[PDB]
Amino acid sequence: SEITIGVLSLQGDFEPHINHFIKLQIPSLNIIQVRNVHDLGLCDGLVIPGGESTTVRRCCAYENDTLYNALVHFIHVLKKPIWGTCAGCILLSKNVENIKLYSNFGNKFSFGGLDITICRNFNDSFICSLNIISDSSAFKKDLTAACIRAPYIREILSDEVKVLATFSHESYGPNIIAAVEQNNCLGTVFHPELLPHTAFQQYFYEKVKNYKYSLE
Template sequence: MINIGVLALQGAVREHVKALQAPDVHVTIVKKAEQLDHIDGLVFPGGESTTMRRLINLYGFFEPLKAFAKNGKPVFGTCAGAILMANEIVGQTEPHLSVMDMTVERNAFGRQRESFEARLNMNRIGEDIEAVFIRAPIINKVGPSVDVLATYDGDIVAAQQGPFLACSFHPELTDDYRMHQYFVKMVREPALHA
């Protein structure tokens, strides 16, 4: 049995919990930093990255989250979660957790009314994957150790660097749970991202 946490400060927490459920997976809703000591992998849901960072600071999560990632435990960030993971954010002087060698641009696909759905072919994961883009960022640039998993209209929308997985969209808002299943596999089989 593996234990995967969903950071429950903001965003579609329930939807991620549902998407992660499997017979050999225990899902923990993470509301306190101490809970990080008891989980094997962590999901950063979407939301609003600046608000999420404020809540991370307010509830004492910043250093524990950095330590969790530094210890090589898998982390999956969706939408705003991907922004938290980037080491560079366009138009912002300081990154948040800075765990992935990538540059992101917030709201790159436009505001709420420009939200859309698309089907993506994703390296390692599958074809025709349902993706919901809501005020989504794009990944402008990745470092040499980052693998691009998917693009949309030429823009990078999903990437992996070792134990870290990030996407611009909201896979939890669909019934297509293949990205979550891939993350569960990353947690279960560390050799996949060594």
């Protein structure tokens, strides 16, 4: 079957995320940039990366929020798989704290999808070992994550949110939440493209594959 995963690309610096899925070497997988609603329509799943949530959001605001509204629909009506990483994780979140830049978009800042409170704030680079709460073969023992000015997940707001991975750091403390999953949404605070392994990419691919299978 042909599976297409898109990577939101408007904000730039998206190539390493694309490369990391290509490294999976999975015959059935195509990756595309997503810059507009036509591109989004071709996607079975979408990755939203980025360093800065406000930048990615402004990129979606063009033409009276045309792409923003399509993303909301994609997430919440179509229920297509979405992976928000770093900035994208912020933009899936219910409550966003410490984003400073006042938004021309108000309560239309987030796309929603993860019932969490997240803090941008806003030392601050390290590799952590992950405790991953999963039976997926994507996750071998002792995997790592690169946290660079990572957002902080302060609150889980629904029992529907599954804490997928946590870590301990001799600062921040124990049981820092690194990855969450809720329905069709996956969120990670780290940079999955900046470590050689491809575990989260593989997991998200399988999520998209299972979605496509469910449809039919």
